[PDB]
Design a protein around this nucleic acid. Structure first.
Ligand SMILES: [Cl-]
Ligand SMILES: [Cl-]
Ligand SMILES: [Cl-]
Ligand SMILES: [Cl-]
Ligand SMILES: [Mn+2]
Ligand SMILES: [Mn+2]
Ligand SMILES: [Mn+2]
Ligand SMILES: [Mn+2]
Ligand SMILES: [Mn+2]
Ligand SMILES: [Mn+2]
Ligand SMILES: [Mn+2]
Ligand SMILES: [Mn+2]
Ligand SMILES: [Mn+2]
Ligand SMILES: [Mn+2]
Ligand SMILES: [Mn+2]
Ligand SMILES: [Mn+2]
Ligand SMILES: [Mn+2]
Ligand SMILES: [Mn+2]
Lengths: 102, 135, 122, 128, 135, 102, 128, 122
DNA sequence: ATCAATATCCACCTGCAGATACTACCAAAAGTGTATTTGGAAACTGCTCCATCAAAAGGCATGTTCAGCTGGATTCCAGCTGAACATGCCTTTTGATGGAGCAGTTTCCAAATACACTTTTGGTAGTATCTGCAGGTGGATATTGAT
DNA sequence: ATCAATATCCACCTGCAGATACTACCAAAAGTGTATTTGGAAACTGCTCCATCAAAAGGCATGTTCAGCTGGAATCCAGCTGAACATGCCTTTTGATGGAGCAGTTTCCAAATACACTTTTGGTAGTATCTGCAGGTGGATATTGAT
């Protein structure tokens, strides 16, 4: 309840701190999910190569916004990315978002 | 005539000209004449039904946890030891989905421009290039 | 009887010591919003219509975004003209630059009407 | 005149600049925000009045249209969806908010013509 | 082994030759009618030559006076009796031409996307919609 | 004297003689100038309908930029549109132009 | 030989801030412009130095590349064309100036392959 | 009773002269630019290369543009963090947000170098 | 393959728009000295909400089958658009005069800022109780598709 | 056109997350009063540069002829991709707990503002010389396209 260590982040000792390696999570953006986004976009038929192409485009989109959001986070000396860090990052990339503050 | 009595000639007799219409394909009547039956909507009908469904709703379309792991993985590659407000992740998901949906709208316009109804990687590429995201 | 001077300024919750009623955990810094004003306007236009908190968060972003866009445009206008004062005239021109046709027209009318009224008092 | 002392209150005391300008939006707050944002060294008295009136006016416009969308959808409470329908179906607000995303707004129903079925979908010589 | 055959004097491109007559004949059509297959570049060869010529230069491509007139006319709709600094008009022309040239590049990508080499109004329209100019 | 239908002679097709004061103007942006612009843009073949389309697009562009430039001119209480008025108008329309800030 | 605080001799503008920063760009002017730009209430002393250095560095990067372009075109004087060539052929400068128009800059030579002679076949080996 | 102390080829003298103001400061409204500094940098990178006036104006626009973008970004950064001061740290972070990869690394390296030198400077 | 008809390029030459070198002048740009104010980092810690665990279960993802109908390839040819010409309209230039009006300067006052008090108010917090509508059911009506 | 398989519509209903309602407190927000400072509007006008002529000189737009080759219509068909289905897993949901770390509160000085004063400099102006390269000429040779 306020005891531990920190420094490098978090941790315990008597076997208690998680965080497994994160990899290949872009595959979590599934074919059904992309089909649903395309449907809301008014798309009726989709070529098989669209799914990997869409993952690639989303990865670039996310890398760009997250890069700026984390830059705001670090400049503020924080270790937690805030909704505001994301809103400002979105705004500076010309993707203004309403609903999350600011 | 033949001046006798039979009542054969003509009236359906003589030869055929009556014993009409199709033979099968009503509900089943397995005698052969109409294949099987299981119900199927035609290709495109359900796709159009899904467009109407999703354009009427607003819920996020990517699963939440899988999107959250992608965000964490990418962020982690930029800077280790980050934590995220949960609304920061929802903000990224709202923005990401609105971005993709709008891009699929432009991509569809590109497929249609080429006389297709099927979007392909080159349509996405053309839309991103005209947008200035690529070249 | 008397409040000032100091200290205390930014009181609430110091260690413990409490009389009655459990409240005010070390005063949160106030986060202002346009919500009560947005709500006032909503009732003028649609008396029996409510608004969800998410829609209100959207309205708050909208008002803050337009405020920043108009003020930024006015700022630039003043600097371009080597003026150190943003007057209603810089706001008016920023409005004409930022808003599309009919909206700018009605916005300019309301802004002008308000300044004329404001200056008609005292 | 010369300091000394004064008496009586007619100007206001309890009269806000908002009431004085005939507004619902806060003139005092808008004036403070203009000063806090570093837009210029000085801010005239009329600037926050004009700006508050404009913000109030735009708010009324979006709420008018949004309440209409909620009514059209048989709802009495405005949600993000109604704001998005109000904005995207209005030419001028759509342009003002052209690069803005309203969270949980969805999109306007819109299917390109060429994608709808037809011709009873039966070839030309009775086939596929 | 001779000198004959030619005996084609030493110089002189004159056709009438060494005896009266002095027309402008040489090796074409001193008459009045045909020609014998004049030279013609194929359709597309000169278009390609122009693309290379214009992509190498930076000079404005719209005539100055007609452009100035257009600008003054448009401005008169917003405020009458205006004057223009010469560089104001030039700034508008530099910006307008850069805008149109970049739009033609996008329009060209749209034509090619549709398997054409000819740009059409629908290509300009698609490009402007994707850019967010029409949209 | 009617004469001809296109070729030699005098008075034949292509014989106008005035200079504006309400005439061409947008029509003054010629087919040849548009073709040149397209060539610099890498275009090899052009539809006959492109010319009017281009004029329409160019008029919208100028209306947009000139409207804002004139708004700056009036705010300054000037009667003369300056290069800076145009530079500021272009910048706010996302079309920053370098070379005219003297 | 004593005095104190050094606030005496050479009371003149000893060294410019740019000289002390090892810069060619005017630190004092950058300081003044930051202050008159209404970017913030206060401007720290190192801000105009850091910024002047960045402005000088970027200028050097573009001049280096435009000078190379002038040289490749057999010229000793950099004109707008050379700045355009330099920026557009440089991936990063091109992106930084992605929404900027260099007057009298022209465009980069570029013909879509499908438009080249003989149906469609890029070919070329000179610059391709 | 005069002998025409001065002919008629312009204007005559007005009693005494001016050793300042009227000298030549009127239409002297100073219009500054980065031209002489851009020129100095060109010499360090290309000693034998010149630059046309039109090209120099492009450069002046360039430096002014980047200054505004970096300063504007620094401004928002400080405001977002509720800081009334723009320090080298805000300039650095603004540079990282505005400039593409490699350009940012070298810009940051140059900025940090100038501030260090400047610091360790008399 | 041969070779004419043109386009295109390189080497050189020179006038001149435009860059350059030198001197003169000055307001303001900039730096230095000293005296006061204060933004915001330290240090300490209240208090939020982020990471993570647990367990249950059903919405939804996955993987497969089957074939409708789309995209891709081919062929044909009407007619649009490019290339080449003949005119001759009208932009371009340049030379040079009015005068509009931008822009420099001096006044001067309406309104801004600074400062000290006092009242007012929006936001935050604790508690409780309504209320609009999501989500579900069940039957009626509509849509789609086979014959 | 009839019939059937399903989707879709709507009335009716209930649970409840979110919305909404009073009581309480207060630190910042906001208004009123006086005094002090000053930004920039108003009037005058100097001189920069914008508008209009004048007026040849010919670069370049426009109209015409001809047909090459492009756009797009018409056909065929391999197999991609949509629809439907079985299976079962992993996202979602509901509830909990430690503790990282965001953020409130007071202290305290390095560094910024505020000023007076001295010095330095970039910009404006003349007057004057210098020069990179555009534009022109030869002539070579590369390209295009018919034979
Ligand atoms: Cl593809
Ligand atoms: Cl005002
Ligand atoms: Cl078309
Ligand atoms: Cl600093
Ligand atoms: Mn990783
Ligand atoms: Mn303090
Ligand atoms: Mn499975
Ligand atoms: Mn088949
Ligand atoms: Mn097809
Ligand atoms: Mn006058
Ligand atoms: Mn209250
Ligand atoms: Mn429902
Ligand atoms: Mn003054
Ligand atoms: Mn034919
Ligand atoms: Mn073809
Ligand atoms: Mn801790
Ligand atoms: Mn000097
Ligand atoms: Mn040359």
């Amino acid at each position: 309840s306020g005891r531990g260590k920190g420094g490098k982040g978090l941790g315990k000792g008597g076997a208690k701190r998680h965080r497994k390696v994160l990899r290949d999570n872009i595959q979590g953006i599934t074919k059904p999910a992309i089909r649903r986004l395309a449907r809301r976009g008014g798309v009726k038929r989709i070529s098989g190569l669209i799914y990997e192409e869409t993952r690639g485009v989303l990865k670039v989109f996310l890398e760009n916004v997250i890069r700026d959001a984390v830059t705001y986070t670090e400049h503020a000396k924080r270790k937690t990315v805030t909704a505001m860090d994301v809103v400002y990052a979105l705004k500076r990339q010309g993707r203004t978002l309403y609903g999350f503050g600011g | 005539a033949r001046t006798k009595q039979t009542a054969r000639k003509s009236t359906g007799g003589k030869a055929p000209r009556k014993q009409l219409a199709t033979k099968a394909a009503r509900k089943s009547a397995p005698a052969t004449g109409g294949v099987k039956k299981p119900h199927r909507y035609r290709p495109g009908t359900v796709a159009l039904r899904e467009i109407r469904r999703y354009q009427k709703s607003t819920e996020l379309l990517i699963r939440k946890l899988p999107f959250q792991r992608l965000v964490r993985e990418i962020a982690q590659d930029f800077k280790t030891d980050l934590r995220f407000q949960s609304s920061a992740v929802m903000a990224l998901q709202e923005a990401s989905e609105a971005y993709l949906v709008a891009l699929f709208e432009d991509t569809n316009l590109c497929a249609i421009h080429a006389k297709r109804v099927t979007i392909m990687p080159k349509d996405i590429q053309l839309a991103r290039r005209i947008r200035g995201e690529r070249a | 009887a008397k409040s000032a001077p100091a200290p205390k300024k930014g009181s609430k919750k110091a260690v413990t010591k409490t009389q009655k009623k459990d409240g005010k955990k070390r005063r949160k810094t106030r986060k202002e919003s346009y919500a009560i004003y947005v709500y006032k306007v909503l009732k003028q236009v649609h008396p029996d219509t409510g608004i969800s908190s998410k829609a209100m968060s959207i309205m708050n972003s909208f008002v803050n975004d337009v405020f920043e866009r108009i003020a930024g445009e006015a700022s630039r206008l003043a600097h371009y003209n080597k003026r150190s004062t943003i007057t209603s005239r810089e706001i008016q021109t920023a409005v004409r630059l930022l808003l599309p046709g009919e909206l700018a027209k009605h916005a300019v009318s309301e802004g002008t009407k308000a300044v004329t009224k404001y200056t008609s008092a005292k | 005149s010369g300091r000394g002392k004064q008496g009586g209150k007619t100007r206001a005391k309890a009269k806000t600049r908002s009431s004085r300008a005939g507004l619902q939006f806060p003139v005092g707050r808008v004036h403070r925000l203009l000063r806090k944002g570093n837009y210029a060294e000085r801010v005239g008295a009329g600037a926050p009045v004009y700006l508050a009136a404009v913000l109030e006016y735009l708010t009324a416009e979006i709420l008018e249209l949004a309440g209409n969308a909620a009514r059209d959808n048989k709802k009495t409470r405005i949600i993000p969806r109604h704001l998005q329908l109000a904005v995207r179906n209005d030419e001028e607000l759509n342009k003002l908010l052209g690069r803005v995303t309203i969270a949980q707004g969805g999109v306007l129903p819109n299917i390109q013509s060429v994608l709808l079925p037809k011709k009873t979908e039966s070839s030309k010589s009775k086939s596929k």
